[PDB]
Structures are given as C-alpha cells and as structure tokens.
Amino acid sequence: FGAMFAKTWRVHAIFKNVKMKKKIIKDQKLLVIVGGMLLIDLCILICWQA
Amino acid sequence: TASIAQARKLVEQLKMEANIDRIKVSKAAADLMAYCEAHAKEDPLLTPVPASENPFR
Amino acid sequence: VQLVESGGGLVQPGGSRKLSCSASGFAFSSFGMHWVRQAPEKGLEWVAYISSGSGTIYYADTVKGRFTISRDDPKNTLFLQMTSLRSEDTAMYYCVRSIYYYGSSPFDFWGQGTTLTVSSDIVMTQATSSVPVTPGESVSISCRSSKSLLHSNGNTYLYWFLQRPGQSPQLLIYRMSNLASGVPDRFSGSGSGTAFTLTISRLEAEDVGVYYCMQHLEYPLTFGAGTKLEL
Amino acid sequence: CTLSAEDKAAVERSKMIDRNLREDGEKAAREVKLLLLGAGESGKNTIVKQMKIIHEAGYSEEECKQYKAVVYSNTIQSIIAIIRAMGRLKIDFGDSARADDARQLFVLAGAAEEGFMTAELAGVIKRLWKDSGVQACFNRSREYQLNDSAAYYLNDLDRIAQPNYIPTQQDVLRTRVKTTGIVETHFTFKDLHFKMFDVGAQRSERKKWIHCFEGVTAIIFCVALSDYDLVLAEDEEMNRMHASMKLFDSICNNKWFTDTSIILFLNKKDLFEEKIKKSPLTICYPEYAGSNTYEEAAAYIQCQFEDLNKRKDTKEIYTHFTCSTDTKNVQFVFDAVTDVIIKNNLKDCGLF
Amino acid sequence: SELDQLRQEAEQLKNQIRDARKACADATLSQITNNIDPVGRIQMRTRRTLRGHLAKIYAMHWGTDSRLLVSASQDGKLIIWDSYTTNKVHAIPLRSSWVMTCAYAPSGNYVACGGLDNICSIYNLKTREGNVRVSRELAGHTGYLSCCRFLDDNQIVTSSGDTTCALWDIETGQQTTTFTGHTGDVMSLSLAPDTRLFVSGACDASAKLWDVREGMCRQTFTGHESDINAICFFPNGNAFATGSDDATCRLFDLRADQELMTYSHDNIICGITSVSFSKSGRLLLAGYDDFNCNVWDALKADRAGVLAGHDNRVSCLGVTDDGMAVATGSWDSFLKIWN
C-alpha cells in the first residue's frame, strides 16, 4: 500500500505545479519514502518484540 | 577597387612569411624531447606523488 | 565604509541599555559583526560575535546570560541589548566589522566607540609594555601565546593592531605576514609556535601608539594588554 | 571537529551561497525558452504581432519592479555619462560655476558604489544639462560611440529624478533597441513566462553558434502558405518553398537537437486556399499529383515538411494552420509547449 | 589585370613557402622518438567534485595560486571555487546569461566574462564594500566573444565572432591594437609564457601567430580539415597544439614552421573541444564531444589513458600552474578536479 500511495503521490505533485516543469526525481525519491514507512513499522514492531 | 587593395595586402603578408628563418624539424623535435626530460620530475601527473604531497589526497 | 554606534550614557547598577550601530557604504548584510569594549585600565576585551548569516552567536563568558546581540539587515543596524549591568561593564564599545573567506581580512574596519558608564583558553602575554623609541629608529616588539597558534592547515592566526590617541584600533598585520590595505610597507612580522614578533623598519610619528596582538584560532577571542611605543 | 574558527565561518558563507542559488533556480524554472528560426519575410511577425496584439501580457507587476530596478541602473549610467562626457573632451569648455567639479566628484563616488538613485545626484544632472558649456560640448562628444538611446538617459531626468518611479516601456527600450545579436521577446501568458529568441541575419554558418542552445523547449518555424507562387529573389532559379525546406531540413535534423520539439506554423492559410484554386501547387512542386482542394494541397505541403524529418520516431513535429483573424493561433502554442514540457519531463523519468 | 597579377604573385609566394617548409622536413617524429621509454598506463581519478551550477558549463579557468578556479555556465552566474575544500568563495550575477568565456586575472583582483553580447565585462573582486562590481564594460566588438585572457593588470586580449582580435587598455577602456587577417570567426586564444606573443585559431582551418605589440601576424599554420576548436602552447613557449572538428589534434612548431605530429585513432570520430599540456609537456590532454577526455603521449601519439566520468559533452579542460591537478567541466553542469 505504501508503494501504491507513493506511485499516486508523484502524480499529485507533477500535475499540481508546472511552475517548474522539471525535477521529476524519477525512481530514487520513491523507494525512499516506502523505506521510511517500512522503517517506522519496523521500529514499532521491534519495540513490541522487545 | 577593394579586391585589388585586398590582394595587395595578401601579397605583402605572403612576402613577409616567405622570408623568415627556419630550422630543420629534426632539431626542433630534439629540443622538445630535451625539455620534457629536464622537467619530467616536476610534473605530478606523470610522476605519482604521495598523499602527504598531493593537496587533494 | 562607515560604522557609527550611538546610544550610550550612564546607567545605575542592575539596569539595562541598548546600543546600536548604523552602517553605510558597504554590503551590510554580507558581513558579520563583533563587539569589542575597551576599559581604560585593561585595554581591549572581546564581547560577542554574530555570524554574517544567523544562528551562530558567541558570547564572552563574562557577559553570557546578560548580553544579547542581533542584526536587522533591512535597516543596516546592529543591536546590543545588555541587562543586569555592573560597574565592570564600564568601557568604550566599538562595532567591529569582519568577513570570513579564503583571503579575507577579518578585522579591517572599526567604529568610533560608544561610552557605557555604570554608576557605583588562550592567553596572550607581553614584556615591558612601554619601549622608548625615537623617530627614525627601527622598532622590534613581540608577544607570546599560552597555546600554539599554528593550525594543521598550515595557517597561523595572529593579528596585530595599532591604536593611536583619540582613535579606534586599526589593523596592521593579519596571519603573520599579510598587511591590511593602507598599511605602509614599513610594517612586517614573523614567528612560529607560541612566540611572534612585529618589526617597523623606521619609526615615524604616525606609528606612535599602543600595539595589540590577538589570536583568532578559537573562541573566545582575547587581546594582549598593549605596548605603548612612545618616546 | 578539525576546522578553525575562520574555516567554519567560511563554510557558512559557502552554504549561504548555495541557498541563494537554490532559491534562484526555483525562480529561474518557470519561463519557456523558444527559439524562432526561419526564412526572412516569412510571416514570423504575424506570430509575434499576434502575441503583441492583445497586450494583456504587458510589463508585469513583478517585471515593473525589475523595471524600477532597470531605471535605477540606467539612471546611474545617465549621471556618470554626463560628468564623464564633459571630462573626456578633445576640446574643453568652461563651466558656469566652479562648484560643478565638486558635483562631478559626488556623482562619480556614488556611481562607483552603483547602489540607488540619490536625489542630490539627480540634482547634478539637471543642473549640468542646463549649463550651456556642458550642452555645447555635446556636438563634439557625440563623435564617440554613444548609445543611440543616450538622449533619453538625460532627457528623462524630470521623471527618473523622482524617488518613486512609475515605469514605462522606454525604460527597457533604452537597452533593447541596440538590436545586437539574437534578440528575445519577453512576455507572459496565463501566469507563465516566455522568452522567444528571434534569430535573423545571423550569416556566418547557419548552425554553428546555436548548438549552445540545446535544451530549448521548442523551435518555432514559420512558412507562408500563400507565397508558394513566388520565386526567391536572391536566386531566381529557386522557388521560396524550396529555400524554406532546405532550412527546415538542415535545422530539424541537426545532431545538436535530436528530440527537440519543433512547432511548424503554416501562415496565410486563407489566402493560400483562395489561390490553389487558380494556381496548382505544381508551380512550386511539379511532382504534385492531386486536386486543387485544400484537404489535398494543405496535406501535401504538410507531408512534404514532415518527410524532411530523419528522426520521425524520436522528434515530434507539430503543425498548426494559422490566419490573421483567430485566437487559437496564440493558444495553440501556449498549450503545445506546455505539453512538450510535460512530455519531456515524462521522458526524463522514463515513465513514457 | 592588376588583380590577376597579384594573384599570380600570391601563387608563386605560396609555393615558395610550401617548398621552404618541405625542404626542412629532414625527419619524422616516428623516426626520432621511436626509442623513448613510454609514459605507460596512466590512471587519473577524480579527487573533488564541485556542485552548484544549474546550467551547461561553458568556461573554466585556473587562478595563479593553484587553489582558486573561476567557472561560468548558462545559468548566468560566475562562481569562484576553493578547490581544496569545495567551498564557494564568490558568486557573481551576470546581466546576460549567454556567457562563452571567462578569465581569472593573474593578480587575483579581477575576473573577465564575455559572450553573445559582444561586450567583455571586467569584474573587481578585491573590493572594500564586500560585493563584486563591473569596473569596465569593454564594448566595441561586432561579434560574439569566444575567448578572453588577461595579460597583466589592466591589459586583456579578446577574440570576436567578427574575425578580429583586439588588445584592450582596461583603465582607459579603449582598444590599442587590432589583429586583422583571420577569415573565419575566432574560436580560441592561447597566451605564451611571455605576454608579447600569443596564437589564435578561427573557423577557417588555420592558426595564426600574432605579435602583441606590433599587431602583425608572423606565421600561419594550416593542415586542419575543419574549424579549429581549441589551441594551447607547449610549456616551453616554442610550440603549440590545436584541436578541431576533424577529431584530430595537431602539434606545430614555431621554428620548424610546420606540423610535427597528429593525434588520432581509427575509432575516434568525435570532435575536440579542449586541449592542454601537462607541466612537463610530455602528456597531451584533449576533451571530446563524446563525453570523455583522453591522454596522449606528446612524443609518440600513443594513447596513455582515458578520463571518463562526465555524462555530457566536455566543454572545459585545463591544468593548474604547478601541474598538480587537472580540472574539467562538461555540459552535465559538474566540475571535476582530477588527481
């Protein structure tokens, strides 16, 4: 679900503002926030297991 | 006529260049080789240097 | 390039006051500022520093908690707000301009001085404090540090200043060998480690005054007492 | 942890410079860069004039602020120009007052700082202009390389001496009329900025200087459809249609611009349509083998230009048929380049 | 008849020059350097990457302290770099973003910037106010400025797309010498380690040796098949090398008055954008439009290495005064300091 939501969040950004046509960021920006969400659930789950 | 005046300037330039000192190319090559050898050790790009010497380490 | 500071006067112990400095003639917002205050019995003492940007501020430990420094670029005005003032705070306060980058001159322009009257690390040392000199003679003076002033980057951070009677200090020499703009080539210096010297080839009437040396290696900044090169 | 007190301050300076560059870059991004190429007297003005016909896109409010900045810059140039012009003469004149030299020093000191307009220095140019000696030396001074607009720098002292400026078009024309090199037109459309670079009389090598402009959003190319029956004046054996095609072929296939969009505007479509019924395209395209009907003549010419593209699978060519009485002519390019930019950024990410 | 007679004289003079040069070609370099030890495999690596430009880089120049660089890109700003700490010391806004060239004054007090506006702007960096301002606008050229180099304080030489070079007196703001005789637009300048002598190249497949004080061309060098893109001196000041759109770099010698060497390979079809020598003159560097820079053995014309890393066309190349490091730049908007 985080991959789905990032895939659609990119679309939100590009369409809303073209003031700047460029800086799409490609693939690299995305794997970052999905890893952020995996990191937060990983920390909550590891503190639970601890 | 401008074409004639311009042709005259060209001939005058050629007359100068046609009358200059020249040397054999074999000597010019020897002089360039000697320069490269004389300064061979002053060129860090051909002679590697240690990190303590390279300001960019 | 001019820096004038006004807003002094006499206060009672425990009170507060605000000093300001009006700048003109230079890119005010690109420069940092120091406050340095001079007590008649002590000489120059560093008070506070504000970065040319924001967010980086240092105070001398003797004023920390009582002094506040701020800058308002839209009005080319520097401020100093002081509270809980004590008799020890009585001094002539100068606004000092400084800019830092490779090859800069960190203490080039000094203001004229505002008097504050209150009713009622690395230590630099010097010898003699008063060498008699006659115009036309050479002069050699020196001072010492409690700490080595040589950084691993190859630079030494020792500055020499001259203050004449009735004038604010002016910079002569920074980083051992570099002269400030307008400084005659009569002045030079050298040294290593913790001991450094200043040389004058010929003592001219314009050279008579009190010489200071200070370090700018680490904070806080400090000054030597000053050597008076009078006849 | 290894830096000196000064080294750390130097790093803060560098970071603040990066901050200012980043802010500048964001501001920099909005304008669309358009490069205008093509044959002389080709109906290019119709494209430009139409953009200029409405005038909605006038000096912007923000642009007006820049103009206030432009006026300050030109006003400083004006006051130094007059005290400099009278101090570099081949023949000197006597001043009306010995005080004028002190005024010159004040102007030169203020101009050296080059900050903003000072009312006292604005007083100097007003007095120097009235002084008959300063005006009298003009006839000799003007022998040098002066700006043709230089008369405005001085003559406008009445208004540019006022601290609160009201900007006008002359305030930027002072430097625009120089017409040196490529000259761009700055305009806006629906809160987008544009700069269209008008290339004319370049000479030299047609394609050598330009390479530098790789990355331009689109190249604008114009052809006048109704002029298909005219022979090129420079070379009486060549029809103008073939000269435009040779330029298109040599520009659109330039290795410097491999996928750079091209927007082709075919002008005078109404005069064209009312002429092909009298003069078949065979006047300029003897190989033409169609009827005298718009859907065939207009499609043939469009096809002939499209067949000049050697990178059909990479560079998209846009075609629009224009006339002097329309509003789609200006809206087309507005939307077309916006779509090109979106197509480009989608290509960059690889989504497309 | 008068025009043809001058053509007849020109034809004989040109043949006499060619014959005089051919009579001096008593050996080829392939017969002379045959038994020199090779330079071997040279592997240069990036030590600094300088980031900040937002546009294609067009100009880059070393300062005389071997520490500072000035660069310019189409974003309309100059940056003064501290190469040791990747710090920005100055950022100078331009009134026109279309920049082609810049120069670092040998004294460090000024820099030059020029371009499509045909005006060379001289900036004062060593100011008291803290900002950087234009001291002079050297207007008077009728074409783009492809190159400018300082000779001394208040003395600069400029190229122009109007095919004429000029020597400017900056303090007075006037031209003192004009150098006419080029056929094509002037593409680049190079100064000898002697301010009285320099060479230039132009879009006419010919390089010319100019006398700064006399204003005369003393030698003309040919052999290129296409326009000259870059020129530089051999470190000894008695020779120079050029690059061109024909993807061949050529080495000329002033006193031999002829070409000595060519540098090419069957698998190179890419143009040359920049050339320089290393401090010893033994390594010849060249940047190409194929994104890479190569390393040539200046005495053998063998390949010694490749400097790969840029993702777009190489626009700038040069070596610091002490030969310690090489800086390059490209259309990808990064600068790299090698070794």
Author numbering:
A (entry chain D): 568 to 617
B (entry chain Y): 6 to 62
C (entry chain N): 2 to 121, 137 to 247
D (entry chain A): 3 to 354
E (entry chain B): 2 to 340
Q: What does the publication say?
A:
Among the class-C GPCRs that are activated by the neurotransmitter GABA, the GABAB receptor (hereafter referred to as GABAB) is an attractive drug target for the treatment of brain diseases. GABAB is composed of two distinct subunits: GB1 (to which agonists bind) and GB2 (which is responsible for G-protein activation). Here we report the structure of the class-C heterodimeric GABAB receptor, which is activated by the inhibitory transmitter GABA, in its active form complexed with Gi1 protein.
Here we report the cryo-electron microscopy (cryo-EM) structure of the agonist- and PAM-bound form of the GABAB in complex with the G protein Gi1 at 3.5 Å resolution. Our structure shows that Gil binds to a shallow cavity that is formed by the ICLs of GB2, which provides a structural basis for understanding the distinct mode of Gil coupling to GABAB. Intra-subunit conformational changes within the TMDs were located in the intracellular half of TM3 and the entire TM5 of GB2. Similar to class-A GPCRs (in which a D/ERY motif constitutes an ionic lock that stabilizes the inactive state), K5743.50 and D6886.35of GB2 form an ionic lock in the inactive state and become weaker owing to inward movement of TM3 upon receptor activation. The GABAB-bound Gi1 adopted open conformations, showing a notable separation of Ras and helical domains and the displacement of the α5 helix away from GDP-binding sites.
